[PDB]
Design a protein around this ligand. Sequence first.
Ligand SMILES: O=C1CCc2cccc(c2)Oc2ccc(cc2)C[C@@H](C(=O)NCc2ccccc2F)NC(=O)[C@H](CC(=O)N2CCC[C@@H]2c2ccccc2)N1
Ligand SMILES: O=C1CCc2cccc(c2)Oc2ccc(cc2)C[C@@H](C(=O)NCc2ccccc2F)NC(=O)[C@H](CC(=O)N2CCC[C@@H]2c2ccccc2)N1
Ligand SMILES: O=C1CCc2cccc(c2)Oc2ccc(cc2)C[C@@H](C(=O)NCc2ccccc2F)NC(=O)[C@H](CC(=O)N2CCC[C@@H]2c2ccccc2)N1
Ligand SMILES: O=C1CCc2cccc(c2)Oc2ccc(cc2)C[C@@H](C(=O)NCc2ccccc2F)NC(=O)[C@H](CC(=O)N2CCC[C@@H]2c2ccccc2)N1
Lengths: 218, 218, 215, 218, 223, 222, 223, 222
Amino acid sequence: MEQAMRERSELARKGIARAKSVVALAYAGGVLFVAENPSRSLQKISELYDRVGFAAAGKFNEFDNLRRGGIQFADTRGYAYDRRDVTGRQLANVYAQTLGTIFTEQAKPYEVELCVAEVAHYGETKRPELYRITYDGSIADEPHFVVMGGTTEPIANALKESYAENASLTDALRIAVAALRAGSTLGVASLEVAVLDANRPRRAFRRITGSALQALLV
Amino acid sequence: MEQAMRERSELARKGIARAKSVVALAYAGGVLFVAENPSRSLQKISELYDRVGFAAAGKFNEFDNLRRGGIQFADTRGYAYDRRDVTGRQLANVYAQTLGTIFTEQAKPYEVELCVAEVAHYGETKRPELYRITYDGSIADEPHFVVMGGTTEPIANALKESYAENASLTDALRIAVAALRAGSLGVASLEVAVLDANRPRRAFRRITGSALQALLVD
Amino acid sequence: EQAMRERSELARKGIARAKSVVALAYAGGVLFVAENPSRSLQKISELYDRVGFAAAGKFNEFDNLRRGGIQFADTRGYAYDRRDVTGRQLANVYAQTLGTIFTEQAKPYEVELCVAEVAHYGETKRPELYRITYDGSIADEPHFVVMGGTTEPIANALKESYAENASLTDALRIAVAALRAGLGVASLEVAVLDANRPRRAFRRITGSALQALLV
Amino acid sequence: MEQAMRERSELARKGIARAKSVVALAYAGGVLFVAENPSRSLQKISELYDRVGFAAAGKFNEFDNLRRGGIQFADTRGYAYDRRDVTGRQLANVYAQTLGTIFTEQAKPYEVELCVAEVAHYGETKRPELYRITYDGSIADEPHFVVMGGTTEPIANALKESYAENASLTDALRIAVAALRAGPTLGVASLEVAVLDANRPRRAFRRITGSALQALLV
Amino acid sequence: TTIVALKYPGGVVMAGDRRSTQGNMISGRDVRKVYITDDYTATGIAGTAAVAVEFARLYAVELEHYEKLEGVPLTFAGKINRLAIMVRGNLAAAMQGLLALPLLAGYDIHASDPQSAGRIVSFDAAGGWNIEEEGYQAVGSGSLFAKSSMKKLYSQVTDGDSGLRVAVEALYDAADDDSATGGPDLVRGIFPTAVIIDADGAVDVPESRIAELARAIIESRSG
Amino acid sequence: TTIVALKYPGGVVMAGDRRSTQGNMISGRDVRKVYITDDYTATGIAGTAAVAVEFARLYAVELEHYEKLEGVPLTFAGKINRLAIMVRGNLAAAMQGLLALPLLAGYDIHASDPQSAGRIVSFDAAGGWNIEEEGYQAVGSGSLFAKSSMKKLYSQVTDGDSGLRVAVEALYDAADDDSATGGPDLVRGIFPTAVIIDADGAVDVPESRIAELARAIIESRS
Amino acid sequence: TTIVALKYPGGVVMAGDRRSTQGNMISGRDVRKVYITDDYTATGIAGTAAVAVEFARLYAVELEHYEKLEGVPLTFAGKINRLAIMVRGNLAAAMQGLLALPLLAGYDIHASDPQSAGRIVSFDAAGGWNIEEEGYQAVGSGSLFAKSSMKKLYSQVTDGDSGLRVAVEALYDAADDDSATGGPDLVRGIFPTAVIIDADGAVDVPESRIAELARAIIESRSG
Amino acid sequence: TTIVALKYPGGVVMAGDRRSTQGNMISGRDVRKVYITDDYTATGIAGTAAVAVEFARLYAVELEHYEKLEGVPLTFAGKINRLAIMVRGNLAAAMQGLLALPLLAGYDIHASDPQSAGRIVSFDAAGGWNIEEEGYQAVGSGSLFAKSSMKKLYSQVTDGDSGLRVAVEALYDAADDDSATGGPDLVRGIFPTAVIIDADGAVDVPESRIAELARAIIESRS
Ligand SMILES: O=C1CCc2cccc(c2)Oc2ccc(cc2)C[C@@H](C(=O)NCc2ccccc2F)NC(=O)[C@H](CC(=O)N2CCC[C@@H]2c2ccccc2)N1
Ligand SMILES: O=C1CCc2cccc(c2)Oc2ccc(cc2)C[C@@H](C(=O)NCc2ccccc2F)NC(=O)[C@H](CC(=O)N2CCC[C@@H]2c2ccccc2)N1
Ligand SMILES: O=C1CCc2cccc(c2)Oc2ccc(cc2)C[C@@H](C(=O)NCc2ccccc2F)NC(=O)[C@H](CC(=O)N2CCC[C@@H]2c2ccccc2)N1
Ligand SMILES: O=C1CCc2cccc(c2)Oc2ccc(cc2)C[C@@H](C(=O)NCc2ccccc2F)NC(=O)[C@H](CC(=O)N2CCC[C@@H]2c2ccccc2)N1
């Protein structure tokens, strides 16, 4: 009972530590997601709703299950009520409930760690919200950045030193790539980058791939 | 059997002991809730029904599940019968049944400690009621104050000698914040709300921002 | 902890005892080569128009998964359109399916799967290869995939002797050679996803045509 | 986990090894099944469909259940599509899936060894097919012969010596009985013999009993 | 059937006739249609006899069931809602002829002012409910004749006794014009029943007081 | 029944009559048909009394249920959707005579221009919803007469008081032509009810004000 | 209602009227019946208002739901099939008066020829779908008047603006002969809505350009 | 609609018209009603357009579904039985006007006599199937005019090209007498579609060849 739950905790923590790292930070235009990802087609960052983004670290099929569940929840909520009623907070809230249930009841706990991010609606001024949901369902509201997966502490402290509010997109991308390298070369071939762009009219999520990303890395 | 229940009781007691502290107390204008909370989006205190409030300590996803179930129970009860038929005693009774079933049947017991408070309806004279429900379904009727989460005895004793019936909101607030200090405190680290017995119907109201600062200064 | 370690051990050991399978991209699409002494029981299969399947391990189990992927692909192609079926989403659902099996089935599956997609006719698109292991781990591979038995000798042999846009004959001999470090018409199952076919790219290379391709 | 499947494979090994032996051989007239059976009414070799036959070794009630289930599958498949869509490869595939499920999921694994054989349809020249399916769902197709039950390796190597492709009927029967005694005198009272006769117009399965069988053993 | 209910200073009165019919034929002469359903409420029901009786019995069980489970009686509004839901759930059968139409009288101990703590609630076949504010109501085939009579007599209501007299006269006028409503049977000595509710609760009115009032009404109509 | 709603600079007004009928017979003189659904919304319902009352009661509970579960009230569009879904779910019963036809008035606290943040949404029996853009709407057996009256009177609307007066006059014209809509009752002192909503929320209009306006209309037309 | 759609070199146009009715009565004057369902797709629906608006909102959610789940949008043929299946599932309710008849216009990003990448798909109440090849299509009670008008006007379609003009004039002819279709309202300033889709995506047409074209058509017909 | 199918030495041809109607109105001019269902099988369907389209699509995926699952295509009898089961399952909806009537033409690679491997199978609304042995068959509202036209012209079928011309002429006769079957459109350049199936499989017939045969038939009629 007490070491069974601690064994589940250690299995999940080990699984999250063995995966590559992800960073989400608030910049002047919204939220930047930067994850170490060598794959061309398998994604760790994703759109959830109009102004709500998703980032995960850990076992792919498990955080992909939760990614799909989040999109299902968000779309169902926006249809049953109205699009504007969907918030990043309630998406993090249901992620915390779901991971809590999984951690206690499923055969194996999920070796995953989630970030839910929300930017302001178009034309409205509101600081980005960042939420972290760990494998046990614990939920944390962060103001500036979230680091997930692998050796997190060196990346967290690199951001602790070099992060500045309202930085440009290029400045934020440099800081994020540098902080990731502190935790472990990283180029367009090994990066998955996307933003929640608060200047988009409806759907804020957009990926930065290939030529555009290379241009912002120089 | 007896060791299984001792282990589950110990897991829950430790989980609550490692949690931040909440107090609720009666004052001249109704009931006051104060809790140590640095989050700006997550909440441990909430409205349940017109004259019934809710406060919890422990794991968030678990007492948020119970907060939601209690809101479901109250809205259904008041609709099937009438609003005045819902009472704090009923909700405490439901939480006691719910937590007891959780404690004996779920894979992991809930690491939560709940307070349900009820104030008088508008224009009526009635003492506030305070109910404490623990992780095993045990339930207690309290006349002056309730403390939950973490190291309770310093906060409890601080309130014991310092509690004054019919205290001002300002007085009772300072008393409660000081009692919280005895254990593990400004606007940024506090969640505070009241069940205001003078509101015509919905007695619950939060005290945040400049109004909370003004009440904290004097 | 011990339950999942024993499950992973049973799956890993079962796959280590199985015969080996190779899939690699060549100039004509994707080539599957597997050591298979049977004439009727197969380890390589079509999934959809431009999507192929290869597996190593316990037959009844990867055959269940083979049929399951076919059911998925035909259902999705009918509920939407044929072009909406991709190799990526087939590998995605295999990862979800194997993850569930590994954690919840009475016995984990001793299987390792490959999903491969070539371009539709008339389009120039690099082939895709996916490896999905017994626990639902999913890997994106650019040139080749090796599964079953002792994979390290075969993988290294391919790593140094792989040529992009190689001919069908050259790719086939590279594959058989890499498998030898672990073989004739009677002991090989060979099939290709031929990117030059108009719709159904999957085609088996069998008997006399396979012999001519080897010699 | 390892201990469970270890003991299950052990239990099925012992049960099959204790039971009596069965052999199926491809000859010039089709496929011949020879089994040691002293009973007069309990049958180990059976028809499955038009050109498909069934032979088993082990616990009777268990391979009788599997025999019936194969008859349900083949009859259902031939009605839902057509008779000529039922193949021995299909029925062997279904037996592998079925025994795999039984081995991993039922209270006790089946102590059985199955052979499914198919001969050509009337007027056609197609090489016979034999399939062996073990208690755990392992399946292999053979070109010449299949041995099941009891001590198999002596019989298998004996046939590996004394097998001739496209041999005579009585030749193959005496070859089979000679391989069967290698693991002292086997007459009609000790034998169950049948054939899939590729020369019959539809139902190839036919038994060989009493006078005829004894005449084939002179 | 006719069941009347009216408010008087400090309480309510409910009274009902005694007749059951099967077409033109009289099938009952002493039917009791006004039920004390708890310490402070009475229910009078018109319609199909079987459904009306089952309704009153089940409704009283439901109120007492809640009180024992929860340690407190339902609020008067809660009592209204449970009755309305009961009627609503019978809508399909009522459309097949199994109709029950209740009328609810009560005394709300939690009311603001005790003088007008009386409550009269009428219902319809869809489960609609309406708290009455003009002092009186009726239900049944004679309810129009009863309400029009009470329209003219209600100003005479100053206390419980005159309230009972007006209710008895309203029933008399209903039976005068509606053959499905029974009048006083002086031959058999059978009279309408009545329930009075005030701060002390709901009590049955003795038939002898009803009889005296009915006889006085009959005498005045005679000349 | 006639229930009216109209926009005025910085708010919205909803008013409804007090009559219930059972055929030609008058069965109610005091019915309250306009409900304060929440702090910024009012609902008025025509149709079968049992259903209309249940709709108003259930809708208010649903809105508050969301606010307590989620810590924030629904957007006004979400409120529209939930009412439409309620009506749509009643369609079969409505075809059987259990009809509820709502009209929604609100003040959107998240609209950009507060001067025009008032909202009026009409519905149909299939659950259709249409946000009105011409400033007024009505529902019930007298709604045609009220909409045509308001068409000629809406130019007079400059603030809450004149919006209330026009609303009451429309209800007067509806009762003038529709026997199923109740006029002002001077003998009993019973008058239409009204709710007015602005940036400070929804409030019931005191009966005395509606009495004043009703008597003025009657005096004028005599 | 009348929704029109037509192909022009490089893209597609869809326009629709603004009227709703209940019987003979006009019940809406600014109804928006043409929805941008994704970045390259527009849907216009005729029939029962409640069902039409629900179809459009659910269909747009369904397409975005797939895009977010799978990382790629549906092929245009996949979008057709989901819309057709939605109509088919409504056939029973449609026979009871809850009819929705959509029209689909789109720009296929995966088409062969970018100047013929415009798509127009018409539907029937049984879930039938047919990709139009003659360049234009319409749906609603004025669709036959609109199609026969576009038959004579289609030759003047050379780009996006001339295609918009033809669409507006078709709607004008539809409203000229069908009272359930609304014509331009010059007193209120209300005009049909329109969406244009090309390689750069789907965009709402500003009310001003539609108003200018409507006035041009109007005074061209008045003399 | 008219779909025709006829056997020629060593193969089979199926051709279909291009028209869809909504009552009297013409609603489609380029409908393709003849489908290549697999390498050796074609189906033409008449009836409610939605059901016919859905039938051809789902039948093709079912045949390929079996092939991929089992490694071998269905026997021709199995293909017949699955199409019959599909029609039989639609019977209740067909009685409500969602009718699909298919016609099956194919080349049996497992045929007993390789010279006579051509196959024509017709069906009814109840799911009944009949292997046609008189060399031709038709389905749809013009099937009687087409079958009577082919009864006279079938003696001219000596190879695949003459069989195609007869099939096209039978469709021409059906359109001549049946307004629900479309004839060649020389203004728009639209002609029936056809599929030919022999030992080398089923292939779409080029439109240029069908247009040539149609023009020759038109000139021989005028
Ligand atoms: O007519 C019937 C038969 C049931 C029926 C069939 C078809 C249509 C129909 C009713 O449709 C109807 C037919 C007739 C009516 C309603 C519906 C009028 C109604 C009535 O008088 N109701 C007065 C009344 C009101 C409240 C409580 C009791 C009570 F009798 N009468 C009735 O239902 C009569 C009642 C009757 O004769 N009996 C004889 C023995 C038991 C029963 C009784 C029970 C309890 C008390 C007094 C009598 N049943
Ligand atoms: O006519 C009836 C019988 C019930 C019925 C069933 C099936 C079809 C039907 C009517 O067919 C019908 C008959 C009549 C109508 C609709 C359908 C009109 C409608 C109305 O006036 N509606 C005005 C109104 C609007 C909103 C809220 C309350 C309210 F009364 N009237 C009604 O439903 C009347 C209402 C009635 O008399 N009573 C008496 C006590 C309880 C009920 C009431 C409740 C609440 C307030 C005021 C009255 N029921
Ligand atoms: O007639 C009704 C009532 C429902 C009904 C009952 C019986 C038969 C019937 C339909 O059968 C029918 C009756 C009438 C029609 C169809 C079926 C025509 C159809 C129409 O105009 N449709 C045009 C249109 C097309 C797309 C989107 C919106 C839109 F209004 N009208 C309708 O359904 C009308 C619409 C209507 O008056 N209202 C008033 C407020 C809300 C609703 C509206 C919603 C959204 C936009 C504009 C208006 N409802
Ligand atoms: O009439 C309708 C509406 C559905 C309906 C309602 C009431 C009775 C009824 C059918 O009952 C019927 C009414 C009419 C028919 C059948 C049943 C004849 C039948 C036909 O022509 N069928 C020829 C045909 C055969 C095979 C494949 C496609 C094809 F169009 N016509 C139809 O179903 C017509 C078809 C039609 O107009 N459209 C326009 C856009 C989509 C649909 C189409 C799809 C695919 C291709 C071409 C057209 N639908």
